[PDB]
């Protein structure tokens, strides 16, 4: 089997990606928030705190006929940028873009973080990294991806984000039309349960390329590209006038500057991302001041390539016996 389903940007920045998931019989369909570094299927539900819905499509698992109760089943999440929500869990029928999971864990909120009640565009996640990430209690749950697998023609899915424009999520094929030369596959460790893998350096705009190791984790849930400070400087550097600015929360630059292009290698290959990619607007509504798509990882814990680097390629997530990590030019 297969599935191919469109992810389309939240907004005018790309903050985000939602991605139609249809659920329970009939299907309710909801947008979910695809998350690489995450390993949670969660939904806003008729569970969910009453005022902490805003606008978000809900699911409702009384008026689906293969919903089942996962008897004593909690789920409590926080993410690496503050948020968090946490509830019970259904079992129930699940389809991404064609491919049918029977049976697949959906987290259903009874509690959602303030950020996500203010982002009405978002029913929920999907997580797509590796189960053993997945905060079901007592009784530790399978990823969608997970569930499918064995399935699967391949198995595999792909990433192709869009820079202000729609994507593409594939499960089980490699569409050999959505990119330019070769996939360079590189090696992922699963150790922390995410899609960690190390790039092999660096470029600044035109500048000569830095070889170094960088390790750090496809996360397709997270905006931007988080690197250590060394490089971060580096990079800003090159940008008249920008500077790290802690009352704001990391680096901005003027809006009137164009801004380079960032290259980072996979194994052999180079994965360039336009300086556009790495403008994310005024910091305030009519602000001068522009706020960057690079940002320094430190105090993360974790470098992290986020949207910014990620929808510059076509990525393939290996879950064969050894998993491994593709990129390709697009």
Same mark, same amino acid.
């Given at each position: ?37 995450? *390993?949670?299927?969660? @939904?806003? /539900? !008729?569970? &969910?705190?009453? $005022?902490?819905? =805003? +606008? ?5 698992? %009384? ?44 987290? *259903?909120?009874?509690? @959602?973080? /303030? !950020?996500? &009640?203010?982002? $009405?565009?978002? =029913? +929920? ?5 590796? %189960? ?53 596959? &590189?090696?992922? $460790?699963?150790?922390? +349960? ?137």
């Amino acid at each position: 089997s297969t599935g191919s389903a469109t992810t389309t940007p939240i907004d005018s920045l790309d903050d985000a990606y939602i991605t139609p998931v249809q659920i329970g019989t009939p299907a309710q369909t909801l947008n979910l928030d695809f998350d690489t570094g995450s *390993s949670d299927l969660w @939904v806003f /539900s !008729s569970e &969910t705190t009453a $005022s902490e819905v =805003d +606008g978000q499509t809900i699911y409702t698992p %009384s008026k689906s006929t293969t919903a089942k109760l996962l008897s004593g089943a909690t789920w409590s999440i926080s993410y690496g940028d503050g948020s968090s929500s946490s509830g019970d869990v259904y079992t129930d029928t699940v389809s991404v873009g064609g491919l049918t999971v029977t049976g697949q864990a959906v987290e *259903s909120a009874k509690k @959602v973080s /303030s !950020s996500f &009640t203010e982002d $009405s565009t978002i =029913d +929920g996640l999907l997580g797509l990294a590796f %189960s053993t990430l997945n905060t079901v209690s007592p009784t530790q749950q399978k990823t969608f991806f997970d569930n499918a697998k064995a399935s699967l023609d391949s198995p595999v899915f792909t990433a192709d984000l869009g820079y202000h424009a729609p994507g593409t999520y594939n499960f089980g094929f490699i569409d050999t039309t959505a990119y330019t030369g070769s996939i360079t596959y &590189t090696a992922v $460790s699963t150790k922390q +349960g995410f899609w960690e893998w190390t790039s092999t350096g660096y470029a600044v705009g035109s500048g000569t390329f830095k070889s170094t190791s960088i390790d750090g984790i496809a996360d397709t849930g997270t905006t931007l590209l988080y690197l250590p400070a060394t490089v971060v400087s580096a990079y800003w550097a090159q940008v008249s006038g920008a500077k790290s600015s802690s009352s704001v929360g990391g680096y901005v630059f003027p809006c009137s500057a164009t801004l380079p292009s960032f290259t980072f290698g996979v194994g052999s290959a180079r994965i360039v991302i336009p300086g556009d990619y790495i403008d994310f607007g005024p910091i305030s509504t009519g602000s001068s001041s522009c706020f960057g798509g690079i940002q320094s990882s430190a105090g993360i814990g974790i470098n992290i390539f986020g949207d910014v680097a990620l929808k510059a390629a076509f990525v393939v997530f290996n879950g064969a016996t050894t998993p491994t990590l593709g990129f390709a030019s697009k």
